[PDB]
């Protein structure tokens, strides 16, 4: 569980529709969001696998 894993998702004020993944501290699992390609934060994976691969869920 890396520090950044506890970093909220960032959709930015851009005009796009991307399905990124993050580590939800409420569900404890990695969820997706409609990222807009604006200043993508650290907690932004391209897939649920990358998420678990980065923060290690399970």
UniProtKB/Swiss-Prot annotation:
Disulphide connectivity of cysteines: 5-55, 14-38, 30-51
Keyword Repeat on entry: no
GO annotation, biological process: negative regulation of platelet aggregation; negative regulation of serine-type endopeptidase activity; negative regulation of thrombin-activated receptor signaling pathway; trypsinogen activation
Domain BPTI/Kunitz inhibitor intervals: 5-55
Main location: secreted
Gene Ontology CC, one term: extracellular space
Reactive bond for trypsin, annotated site positions: 15-16
Keyword Secreted: yes
An example Gene Ontology molecular-function term: calcium ion binding
Organism domain of life: Eukaryota
Subcellular location: Secreted
Keywords annotated in UniProt: Disulfide bond, Pharmaceutical, Protease inhibitor, Secreted, Serine protease inhibitor, Signal
Segments crossing the lipid bilayer: none
Function: Inhibits trypsin, kallikrein, chymotrypsin, and plasmin.
Identification of the protein by name: Pancreatic trypsin inhibitor
Shown residues within the full chain: 36 to 93 of 100
């Amino acid at each position: 569980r890396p520090d950044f894993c506890l970093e909220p998702p960032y959709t930015g004020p851009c005009r796009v529709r991307i399905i990124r993944y993050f580590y939800n501290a409420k569900a404890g699992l990695c969820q997706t969001f409609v990222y807009g390609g604006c200043r993508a934060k650290r907690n932004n994976f391209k897939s649920a696998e990358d998420c678990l691969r980065t923060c290690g869920g399970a």
